[PDB]
From a paper:
Two structures are of the full-length proenzyme before autocleavage, from naked mole rat (nmr, 83% identity to human) and common minke whale (cmw, 85% identity). The autocleavage reaction was prevented in these structures by mutating the catalytic cysteine residue to alanine (C143A). Although the overall structures of the proenzymes from nmr-[name] and cmw-[name] are similar (root-mean-square deviation (r.m.s.d.) = 0.73 Å), there are differences. In the α-subunit, the orientations and lengths of helices, particularly helices-α2 and -α3, are slightly different. The β-subunits are essentially identical, but there is a significant deviation in the ~ 14-residue loop connecting strand-β4 to helix-α6 (L4-6). In nmr-[name], L4-6 forms an extended structure that protrudes ‘outward,’ whereas in cmw-[name] it flips toward the center of the protein and sits atop the junction between the subunits. The significance of this loop variation is unclear, because in cmw-[name] it is involved in a crystal contact. In the proenzyme structure, the peptide bond between Cys 143 (Ala 143 in the inactivated structures) and residue 142 (methionine in nmr-[name] and isoleucine in cmw-[name]) is intact as shown by continuous electron density. Since both inactive structures are of the C143A mutant, the position of the thiol was not experimentally determined, but we could model it based on energetically accessible cysteine rotamers and their corresponding steric clashes with the protein. In both inactive structures, only one rotamer satisfies these criteria (Rot1).
[name] ([name]; [name]) is the best studied member of the family and is prominent for its involvement in Farber disease (FD), a genetic disorder in humans. [name] is ubiquitously expressed and found in the lysosome where it normally regulates sphingolipid metabolism through intralysosomal membrane turnover. Similar to other Ntn-hydrolases, [name] is synthesized as an inactive proenzyme that requires proteolysis for activation. The α-subunit consists of a globular helical domain formed by five α-helices preceded by a 36-residue linker region, whereas the β-subunit contains two central anti-parallel β-sheets flanked on either side by a total of six α-helices.
Numbering used by the authors: 30 to 228, 232 to 240, 252 to 395
């Protein structure tokens, strides 16, 4: 049964709060991540090495960095101007080869599963919350080092305030060394989270957005048209929450088109949406064990009682909370609230 009285965070499931850093976009891209990357190269090397070994194990024929590295020069030009220089700055501070920073930035998404939730209270105001796990590759694969690596990643979790001099452009939950983001919001406009979709990974290999929307989109409408129509490297689920009552949708994407766009409709009894890493119309497999208990616990909460505290209760209930859960994030776009908490799951707790 669902957890209760878990907010404000305390106890063994609470690893601590996520530190805040300001990223000044007025600075030259090369310098933006300098302060953040201090003293983080050792941990980041552990993460990068983990990605390599998992990719090599998944495709024993070839070595991944060989291909990225040998195909690297072309990749740099493929990137928009700022990202290349931001990554070179990261490589310099950390003394990590540029190719490995790029490998980390390209493939990080494929090692994340998440539970993303949008809800609307009777007042008509949206809450956006998310539990993020790390280490599970393509939604099912792990190795005997996954748990050690995930614990090493938690100190890299950071809340980022992207600013233009002294004005906040957008806020995000991210990871030092990763210049992209899978969780962010623009105060008073919209919130956005990305869940990985597995249908894909070869496409990236064959080939070898959230930031751009957060940085330059001026409205929920604009972000929606970009997220629905723009081409993307791999399939994904976009969970987009707005400020206005009823501005909440889940976009299921493939490389080229939106396979489904599903909106909240509290008038017709749909006051929440729970998106994990499988298509919501399909039936869940044995491995998809997170969405149903979340829906079960939201149903018991009722729209009347939905809040930060009751939302945190849902995201503190196993298996929604699990051993590989890195952080819990709570967002209220209208009021500008953005809370992120590191998590633990003491035994007995399932991996994911
Ligand atoms: C994860 O496993 C690797 C591989 O080691 C083998 O598998 C283990 C389950 C165990 O049975 C080992 O005895 C096996 O040899 C571990 O890598 C080894 O680490 C130590 C160094 O401290 C040593 O045994 C070897 O140098 C390593 N072997 C290889 C092939 O690299 C690794 O330590 C395991 N991780 C954890 C967290 O235990
Ligand atoms: C968000 O928009 C700003 C301006 O709208 C972008 O800044 C430009 O980025 C281009 C490439 O996208 C660079 O070549 C230019 O140097 C930048 N121009 C200015 C005037 O700063 C910004 O790049 C966009 N978002 C991201 C993530 O790059």
């Amino acid at each position: 049964d669902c957890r209760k009285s878990t907010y404000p965070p305390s106890g063994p499931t609470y690893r601590g709060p996520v530190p805040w850093y300001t990223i000044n976009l007025d600075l030259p891209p090369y310098k933006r991540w300098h302060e953040l990357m201090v003293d983080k190269a050792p941990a980041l090397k552990v993460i990068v090495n983990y990605l390599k070994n998992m990719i090599n194990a998944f495709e024993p024929s070839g070595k991944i960095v060989q291909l990225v590295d040998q195909k690297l020069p072309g990749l740099l030009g493929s990137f928009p101007g700022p990202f290349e220089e931001e990554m070179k700055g990261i490589a310099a501070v950390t003394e990590i080869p540029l190719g490995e920073i790029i490998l980390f930035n390209i493939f990080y998404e494929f090692f994340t599963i998440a539970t993303s939730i949008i809800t609307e209270d009777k007042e008509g105001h949206l809450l956006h919350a998310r539990n993020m796990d790390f280490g599970v590759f393509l939604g099912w694969n792990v190795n005997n080092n996954t748990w050690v690596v995930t614990e090493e990643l938690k100190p890299l979790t950071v809340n980022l305030d992207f600013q233009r001099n002294s004005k906040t452009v957008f806020k995000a939950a991210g990871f030092a060394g990763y210049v992209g983001m899978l969780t962010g919001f623009k105060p008073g406009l919209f919130s956005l989270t990305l869940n990985e979709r597995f249908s894909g990974f070869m496409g990236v290999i064959e080939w070898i957005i959230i930031r751009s929307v957060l940085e330059n989109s001026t409205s929920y409408e604009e972000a929606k048209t970009i997220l629905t129509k723009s081409k993307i490297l791999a399939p994904a689920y976009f969970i987009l929450g707005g400020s206005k009552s009823g501005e909440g949708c889940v976009i299921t994407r493939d490389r080229v088109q939106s396979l489904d766009i599903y909106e909240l409709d509290p008038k017709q009894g749909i006051w929440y949406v729970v998106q994990t890493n499988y298509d919501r119309w399909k039936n869940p497999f044995f491995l998809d064990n997170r969405r149903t208990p979340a829906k079960m616990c939201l149903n018991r909460t009722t729209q009347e009682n939905i809040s930060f505290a009751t939302m945190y209760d849902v995201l503190s209930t196993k298996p929604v909370l699990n051993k590989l859960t890195v952080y819990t994030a709570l967002i209220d776009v209208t009021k500008g609230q953005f809370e992120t908490y590191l998590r633990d799951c003491p035994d007995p707790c399932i991996g994911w």
